[PDB]
Amino acid sequence: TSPALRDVHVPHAYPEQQVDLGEITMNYAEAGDPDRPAVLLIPEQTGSWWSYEEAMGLLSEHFHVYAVDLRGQGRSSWTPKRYSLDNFGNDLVRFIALVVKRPVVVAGNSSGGVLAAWLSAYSMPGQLRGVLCEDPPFFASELVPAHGHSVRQGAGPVFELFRTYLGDQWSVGDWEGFCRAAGASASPMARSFVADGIPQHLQEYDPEWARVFYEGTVGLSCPHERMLGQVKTPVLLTHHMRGIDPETGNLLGALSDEQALRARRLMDSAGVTVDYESVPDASYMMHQSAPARYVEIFTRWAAAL
Amino acid sequence: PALRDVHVPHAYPEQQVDLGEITMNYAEAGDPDRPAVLLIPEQTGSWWSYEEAMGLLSEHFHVYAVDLRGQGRSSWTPKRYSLDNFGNDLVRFIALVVKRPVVVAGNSSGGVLAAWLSAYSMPGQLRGVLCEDPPFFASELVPAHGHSVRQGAGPVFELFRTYLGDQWSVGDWEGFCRAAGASASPMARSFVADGIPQHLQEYDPEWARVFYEGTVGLSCPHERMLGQVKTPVLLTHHMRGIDPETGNLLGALSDEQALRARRLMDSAGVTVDYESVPDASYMMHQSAPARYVEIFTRWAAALA
Amino acid sequence: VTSPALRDVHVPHAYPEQQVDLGEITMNYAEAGDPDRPAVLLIPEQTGSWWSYEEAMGLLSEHFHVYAVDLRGQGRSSWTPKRYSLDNFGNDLVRFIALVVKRPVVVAGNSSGGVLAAWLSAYSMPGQLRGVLCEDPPFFASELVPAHGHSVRQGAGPVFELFRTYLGDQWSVGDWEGFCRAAGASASPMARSFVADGIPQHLQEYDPEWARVFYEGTVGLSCPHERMLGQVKTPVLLTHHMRGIDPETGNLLGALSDEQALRARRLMDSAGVTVDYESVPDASYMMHQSAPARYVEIFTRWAAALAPH
Amino acid sequence: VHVPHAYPEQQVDLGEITMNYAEAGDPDRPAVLLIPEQTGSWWSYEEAMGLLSEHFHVYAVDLRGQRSSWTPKRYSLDNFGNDLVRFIALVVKRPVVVAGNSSGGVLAAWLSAYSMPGQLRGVLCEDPPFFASELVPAHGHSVRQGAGPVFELFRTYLGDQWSVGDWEGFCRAAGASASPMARSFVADGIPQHLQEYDPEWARVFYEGTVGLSCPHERMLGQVKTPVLLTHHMRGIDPETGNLLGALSDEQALRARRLMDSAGVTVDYESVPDASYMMHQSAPARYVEIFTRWAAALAP
Ligand SMILES: C[C@@H](O)CCCC(=O)CCC/C=C/c1cc(O)cc(O)c1C(=O)O
Ligand SMILES: C[C@@H](O)CCCC(=O)CCC/C=C/c1cc(O)cc(O)c1C(=O)O
Ligand SMILES: C[C@@H](O)CCCC(=O)CCC/C=C/c1cc(O)cc(O)c1C(=O)O
Ligand SMILES: C[C@@H](O)CCCC(=O)CCC/C=C/c1cc(O)cc(O)c1C(=O)O
């Protein structure tokens, strides 16, 4: 297995399509009847469009569904030195403008949920009808957050190992060294990656993603407080498992109760309807671990826009 | 300037468009059936930096001149100033207002953004770009080639950051003039004046911060942008030199930096025209409008 | 205001002032007590000069040979543009002990001075220190990217931002009017406290580049607190004064959180030293100045127990 | 990985670290302190020590991160420099003449400006990357246009405290580098001196943290002892525009101007045919230059 050669991809239930956005090619898949309201699905970090493979089938009964590979992931362009929230987000603006061509409901998981909120605030006018942020690391994914734990006290331990042992565009590729260091890590999420083989979704991932989160450059020019304070559409914030590790004090999960509270206050001050669904027993990737439950929450909220 | 009530009338009516995050102010001139042109001002310059050249270009072109975010009547956006946000604003402006392929001309930092659009616009948006005295590399904190911003315009930016401040929150013009008067940078000493120039009153000095601190282009290194340009490019290179007292760069970019930038743009496969005008000021479109429009029209006429 | 930028602001105090050339800088200091008694070094809080301790020095001089110092960028000590770092502050103090005190010392520091006392416990030359008192120290909370809890941006950072912008490096801006306007609009109670009664004398002696390097996270970039605390080599007393959470912002009030204190104590315990912890939640952060008798009581009680059995 | 050498080795506790060193010559003669280049141990000077020990009391040291303590997250010019201040005060206990090669010569200048008063009689800066080892220098080429390419490969393929240790991947990338210095490191086995090196050294130079709080122009403008600056091979690579050698002629001029304004005697010796480690590749030549200059210092 050689992720650096980008020859790792496998079949999926929907055909894969590509669009030139200008700087990058973005790979995506499509499901459902084009006469239905459009939905855009943005995956979690290290997740490709097919992170949503099962939920797409359920959602396609009611919506025209697009799921995308972000730059640095899947079959989309890898762009050294270019990974930032603003480049991710403007990629998605161009996708909506060039491919979807009608208003969309956007759902994103974790960093994808950060980008869904990015679009709510910063898309072109009228591109969006509402957004679902699925377990988003508001503040918790920033190096210098306005509120609560930083990324160094949450997912950063994992990103540090990715940066060191996998490297930009898999330039190091030391899977054995990664597993050795991960098995001895204080992060339960880090220890979770130790395996004989490389998970498929991680084979498709550009680990420079991890560098820009760990080093705090990905969001340097996009502070979360200013983004959250400027959303322009309804927002559903889903909040899954979270807790504090007694051994280290680090955050477990995507964001703390305090970070969720401050994020909700910020979006409420922007003048939009903010719904909050707390599912403390769910994994962060509910759209994949509990697809029917996720689609139930999604469709309930989508119907009331 | 902090209250943003300083604006005055101009030879053209001003229009505003909602791009999403920001409102963009601009002016329009010429016949809607002529080829479209987009003019991007230098740093601290509003759209009306191009007022004279617009008149001359409007005989042949449908001309748009814009205020970038943090300038003029466009939105001020604290903590958001980066090349990619400037650039994508302009992508949106072309898509929502111009709605036709455009020829883009940009002065200094506007010319960096002209090259940004050449490489990173949506497909087919651009026919070609004129980069008027662009500080390739020299406006970066850590350039691949040649002088850094700290050895170029950085001394000016340090003074703006310290004495004017983000969104004019400090606004110590007397303290700025005192310090600029004692600066080794000739460009800094050129701002000493009793009153605040009109263009600078409209300017958000957080601009100077993000250039001085190296954050504006952190996720947009110039060598990767220059190596991915996709349209014909005309690079005009105006006055430049070395100050013996400091070794600092005078002008927008050195001959070495122009050479390395042209090599990258050539490696991207595009036709790069290089016009060296070592007598001209960096803002030739304003100091010598007819000469600027001649160079522009000569080159634009030859585009497919 | 230009007087602070010209550094002609200094006034007399209760003790005469002395200077020593440490190499890069001149360090100003005051001395009290019997040279026959055990030596003590007092390190002020940020914006505080040696005379922050003036009253406590009188009380301590009864039983100790007391030295109180101006750090670089403060008081009459050298202002050093672009050189403000925990390592440069700390090595200044190492040289002061070596060149002036010439005896083992008990070190007591307030807030950032307490961070520097811990620095010395870990990183001084061998045998220079017998123990350190860390008076309300912002362990982790004065860092831009701490291992644990609140960052400086969620604590004292709002004050440092206003100092950086309106006072400026070496007081080059000096916009006190603008500072007060912005401060009166600030959510930080510490920020608002600086407005009344003009520019405090201690602040006029202060180089606000201090505030820049804390706000920008450069002061301790090469000196992470977790590695410092895990390598202390002397007994440590940590006094923990007022602290809480502001409901309006979630920001820390005080020097460090109870979580940060716990994690700091755990690291110092793992270093193999005796760690004492005294919680005084009703005290201001500068207890040595606001309640000198109470401070000297804590100090002397603990210093007595440093005596070998 | 450490091996025997021609001189016995000693260790001293400086506080945070233990410092390894070797000592040679008559303890009655004037003291000399030798600081290696980056990735160099004290025995970088082994042959030069023999020659110098006939007239001088010679000390050669391992800096932190090179048998001296490795100290993760603590590598900075000021921590390097204060280590040496402590070594002089605790070990040498007499004024010293200091010679340092490349980054060691940066530290020799550091000591001239920032040591404790009177610790130093003079410094020799052997091919020092003044400015050129900084991320944002006041003058000339930055580290990214000089030795940076090498440091980037060390950071990625070797890693902090050799935590990655992908020597094969390093050799592959180095052999294909446009930097001749990088290409020079390719070898089937790890050189002994590099086995002794903490590559977090390379990280802090590449990332510009090593000297963040120690800008070179303020250091050079505050030197307090005589300075000898030796300037070896240097040039421009036409393919990249990058600097070859330690510093440019422009950077040497700007450094000399600052040291002149500091108020000290500055001597400049241009040897454009010499490699940067003249004390190792041409020891007799190096000791001739040093012994001449040191004899002119006030006894
Ligand atoms: C490599 C990646 O799988 C590690 C993050 C997953 C995890 O910790 C589980 C708790 C949820 C945190 C998510 C999260 C947090 C971030 O700070 C950034 C992210 O992109 C995610 C993100 O997953 O996109
Ligand atoms: C007006 C002042 O605030 C900007 C500097 C003017 C000057 O030095 C004249 C020489 C040309 C370099 C310009 C320039 C250089 C940069 O590094 C960045 C810029 O935005 C410009 C820029 O003007 O956009
Ligand atoms: C006075 C002003 O300049 C600093 C504001 C101090 C304050 O909030 C009082 C509560 C305790 C925090 C202290 C503290 C905290 C830091 O992060 C850094 C410090 O140097 C101190 C420090 O005071 O040295
Ligand atoms: C990794 C090591 O090989 C360094 C590269 C040596 C080299 O290019 C030839 C000599 C010119 C530059 C030296 C130099 C330059 C720096 O910027 C920093 C250094 O520590 C040295 C230094 O060697 O100490």
Residue numbers in the entry:
A (entry chain C): 3 to 307
B (entry chain D): 5 to 308
C (entry chain B): 2 to 310
D (entry chain A): 10 to 75, 77 to 309
Give sentences copied directly from the paper behind this entry.
Zearalenone (ZEN) is a mycoestrogenic polyketide produced by Fusarium graminearum and other phytopathogenic members of the genus Fusarium. ZenA cleaves zearalenone [ZEN, (S,E)-14,16-dihydroxy-3-methyl-3,4,5,6,9,10-hexahydro-1H-benzo[c]oxacyclotetradecine-1,7(8H)-dione] to hydrolyzed zearalenone [HZEN, (S,E)-2,4-dihydroxy-6-(10-hydroxy-6-oxoundec-1-en-1-yl)benzoic acid], which decarboxylates spontaneously to decarboxylated hydrolyzed zearalenone [DHZEN, (S,E)-1-(3,5-dihydroxyphenyl)-10-hydroxyundec-1-en-6-one]. Furthermore, we report site-directed mutagenesis as well as structural analysis of the dimeric ZenARe of R. erythropolis and the more thermostable, tetrameric ZenAScfl of Streptomyces coelicoflavus with and without bound ligands. The X-ray crystal structures not only revealed canonical features of α/β hydrolases with a cap domain including a Ser-His-Asp catalytic triad but also unusual features including an uncommon oxyanion hole motif and a peripheral, short antiparallel β-sheet involved in tetramer interactions.
